[PDB]
Symmetry: D2
Subunit: 262 residues, 4 copies
C-alpha cells in the first residue's frame, strides 16, 4: 500500500501460464499485494478457478484470459484485455513454459520447434504485446521465468528446454538496453526445484530424495518465485535491470553431493 516499502497496490500485472505451479505462485503474490492481475492460461476451467481464488486475496481486479502464448495475435489480445480492464499494464511476468523431455539422440524437429514456440516465442510475444502499455506506464517491468537448467546447469533429456531457458536470458540482455530509454527494466528469475501440485503426484519419497541434493534441505515454493517477481516489480527495484537471479536453495553451488553440509 502507499507509504509502505515495496508498494504494489493498483499496479497492473499480466502473468502468462498463471493458472498453475510457479505462475499461480507469482499471480497469488501480486494479488495479495493489491495488484490488478490478468492471468493467462490454456484451460478455461483452470483459469476461472484461479481467478475466483485470487480476486479474494486483495483489492485489485483479477481477470482470466485463455491465451496460447506461442501465437503473437493471442498475446496481443491478452494485452488488449488487460488494458481495457485495468487502464494499463505496468508488469509483464513472461512465465509460460513447458518442460517435456527428449534425449538428444532421438529428439525430433517437432519436439525442438514445439518447446521453442512456447518457451521462447511466447516470451518475446508477451513482451511485445505489452510493450506499448509498458511504455505508457512510466515504471514498466518485465520479469521472465527462466530456470537454473540451461543458463547454469545441464540435465540429460532437457537440452532443448535448457536452450530455451538460456535463450530467454540472451533476449533479456539486449531487451534491458533497448527498453531502458522507456524506463522499463527487464530481469529474470531462475527457479531451482520448486514444489508444485504436479510434482506431488510422484510422492513424498521422490521429493525427499531430491531435497537431499539441495543445501536448503527442502524444495522451494511457488511463492518464493512470486515474492522475487513482486520485488523486481516495485519502484524500489528500478535500478536493477538485466539480472538473472536463481531461487534454488543453493542447488547449483555444491561441487558434488559430497560438498553438501548437513
Amino acid at each position: 500500500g502507499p507509504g509502505s516499502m515495496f508498494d504494489l497496490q493498483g499496479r497492473s500485472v499480466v502473468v502468462t501460464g498463471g493458472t498453475k505451479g510457479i505462475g499461480r505462485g507469482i499471480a497469488t503474490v501480486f494479488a495479495r499485494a493489491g495488484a490488478n492481475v490478468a492471468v493467462a492460461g490454456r484451460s478455461t476451467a483452470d483459469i476461472d478457478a484461479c481467478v475466483a481464488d485470487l480476486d479474494q486475496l486483495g483489492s485489485g481486479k483479477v481477470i482470466g484470459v485463455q491465451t496460447d502464448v506461442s501465437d503473437r495475435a493471442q498475446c496481443d489480445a491478452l494485452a488488449g484485455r488487460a488494458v481495457e480492464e485495468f487502464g494499463g499494464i505496468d508488469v509483464v511476468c513472461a512465465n509460460a513454459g513447458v518442460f517435456p523431455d527428449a534425449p538428444l539422440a532421438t529428439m525430433t524437429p517437432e519436439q525442438l520447434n514445439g518447446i521453442f514456440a512456447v518457451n521462447v516465442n511466447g516470451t518475446f510475444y508477451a513482451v511485445q504485446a505489452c510493450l506499448d502499455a509498458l511504455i505508457a506506464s512510466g515504471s514498466g517491468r518485465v520479469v521472465l521465468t527462466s530456470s537454473i537448467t540451461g543458463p547454469i546447469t545441464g540435465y540429460p533429456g532437457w537440452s532443448h528446454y535448457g536452450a530455451t531457458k538460456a535463450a530467454q536470458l540472451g533476449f533479456m540482455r539486449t531487451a534491458a538496453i533497448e527498453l531502458a530509454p522507456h524506463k522499463i527494466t527487464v530481469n529474470a528469475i531462475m527457479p531451482g526445484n520448486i514444489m508444485t501440485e504436479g510434482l506431488l503426484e510422484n510422492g513424498e519419497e521422490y521429493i525427499a530424495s531430491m531435497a537431499r541434493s539441495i543445501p536448503a534441505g527442502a524444495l522451494g515454493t511457488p511463492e518464493d518465485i512470486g515474492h522475487l517477481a513482486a520485488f523486481l516489480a516495485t519502484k524500489e527495484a528500478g535500478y536493477i535491470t538485466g539480472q538473472a537471479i536463481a531461487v534454488d536453495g543453493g542447488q547449483v553451488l555444491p561441487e558434488s553431493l559430497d560438498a553438501i553440509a548437513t
Copy 2:
C-alpha cells in the same frame, strides 16, 4: 505481519556511516529494524545514528570498529546482541577503493585493501555467526561490486580482486551455513551517486551517466532496498546469489550499443 516485514529485525551494517552503507542502514531503519552501524570515525557514527534513530521504531546504535581486526568485529557483534537481544542480518558492507596501477602497486597497498575488504567480510560474518544461528532466519548480505566479478578497471586490479573474493567466500558460506537457515547473498553495485562522488562536480557525473543504459547513476537507497528484500523471510530460498544493481552498465558491448 505485512508482506516483506522487517519490523524488529536486528541488523548490523559495517561501514554504515557513509555512502552505500548509510543507504543500507537507512532503508533498514525506515523498515522498523534495529540497526547497529559500524564505522571508523566517532563523529560520523554519532551523526549517522542521530538521523537513523528518527526513521523508525527500532533501536539504533553506533560502534567504532576497524573491521580488519577480528576482535573488534567480535566486540561489534557483542554490542548488537547486548542491545537488541540478537542479530538477524549482517550487512558486510565495509570496503575501500584506493587505486594502484599494477606496475607500481606495493605490498602495503595490496595487503591493506585485502585487510579491509576481504578480512573485514570474513570477520564480520564470523563475529555475528552465533547470533545468526540463534536467529533462526539469519541473513548475510555482502556488498561486492561489478568491478572484479564482472568488469575490470585499470588501477583497481586489487579492488576487483577483493570484490570477486567476496563472491568466492559466498559460494562456500551459502552451503556451509544452510543447515543453520542462514542465507548468504551479495550485491554488486554499479555506479552509485554518493556525497563523495558529488565533490567531482556535475559534468563528471553526467559523463559517467552517458555510459549507463538507465541514463543516471543509482542511489544508495537502491542498494539498501535490495539488501532489505534479501533480509526478509520471503527471500529465504535465495542463497549464493550475486545481484548487480547497475542500471544495465555491464550489458552493452560498447558505447555504441547504448540506446537513448
Copy 3:
C-alpha cells in the same frame, strides 16, 4: 604424433564458406584434417573447397546444406562419413545476424533466425552423432557470440537469444554425450574482421577497434585456432565451456576503463 596433432582427423564445418566458418575450415585444413564445408551457395562452396584442398594432406569436400532442415544435415553427415570414413569433429558454426528492433520484430523474423541459428546447431550435432560416437574422441564446437551470453546490442535481441540458446544446449549436451567420450564446447567470438565487414570501410573498423582493449578486431583464424585446440586429444577433459575470443571487449566497465 606431435603435440596437438589433427592429421587425418575428420571435421564438418557448417557455414564454412565465408567469414568465421571459413577461418575454422582453413585452420583445420592446414593442420592436415579432412574437412567437409557446408554452405548455401554452390559457387562459394566450390571456391572455398578449391583453396582449402591446397592447404594440407587431408581430403576436402563441399556440400550445399540448409542447416535449418534436419534431413539436409543428415545428408551432410552421410557425405562426410562416405568420403572420410567417419567424423571426429562437428563445428556447428552456421548462423545469421539480421537486425530487428524489439518493437517491430515479426514472427517471421524471430522464427527465421532461430531456424538457422538454433535448429541448425541441434540438427548438425544430431546428424553427426552416430559418427562422433564411432570416433571414440568426438568433438562438438559451437560458434556462439559474446552477444547474448554476455552482452546486449539493441536490434539483436533475437540473435542474442539464439547465441545464448546454443550454450543452454551445450550445458546439457556435454553431460548427455560424455559417456560417448564426446566433448561439447562453445566459442564466443567478439568483433572479428571479415570481408563482409570491410565493405563498411576503414574508418568504421577503426572506430570499433577503439572500444577493444586489444586495439584491433580479431581474425577468423583466431576462432579457427581455438576450435582446433578444442578438437585435439589434448583437450579431452574440457567440456561444457564457452570461451570468448574478443580481445577483452566485454571487460571494461565503459570506454573510460580502456587503457592505451
Copy 4:
C-alpha cells in the same frame, strides 16, 4: 617448432609451484614443447629432481629456483634468474597455491591471512616481478591457476580457498585491460578434480567415488591443465584475454548426481 601450429619452441616460461602436481604438469608440457622453463618451489630436493627430469624432455633450458611466492622480493629474484638464463620471459604461469581446510566457524586470522598470502599475493607478485620482461617480450602471456572452487562452486571447509581462487579472476579482469597496450594476455584455468600423486595416497576407492560425480567418469591429469596453459601461451591465442576456462570433465554442469548420464 617453427612452421608448426602452436609453436612454443624457445618461448621462455616461469612456473610458480612448478615442482609437483598441476604445476609440474604445466612445466612438463612446456618442456616437451621446446620452451625454456624456470620452475619455482619451496623444497630444493623437489626442485632439483623436477629440473633433472624436465631438462631431458626437449631442447629448451630448464632451471629451478627456490621461491616463496608470498614474498615480493623473492618473486623479483625468480624473474631475475629467468631473465639472466633465458634472455627474457614470455609466459608466467602463476600456479602456486595451497588448499588447507578451515570451517568458517573456526577459521582463524592466521589461517585466512596465510592462504591469501600464498594464493593471492603470490599471484600478484609473480606477475609484477615478470612484468618488465613480459613487456619486452612483445607477445607476453599470464596464465593463472585458479579452481572451479570459488568462481563457480562452493565446498564447506574451503570458503577461504574459494575466496582466493575468485580473487585471482577479479585481478585477471582488470589486468587483461591494464596490460593489453603491452600485448600481454591474461587468462585463467579453473581445474576441477585432477589426479595427483598426493591424491593417490588416499587410495583407489576414494578416487573412484569422486569420479562417479564427474560426467567424464574419471579425474583429469596434470597434463590436461598443462596443455591448456600451453595453448594460451601460443601466438595463436593472442586474441584471447580475460577468460577463465574450466578443465573439469563437466563436473560443474549437473544439477545434481541424478543428472549424470552413464
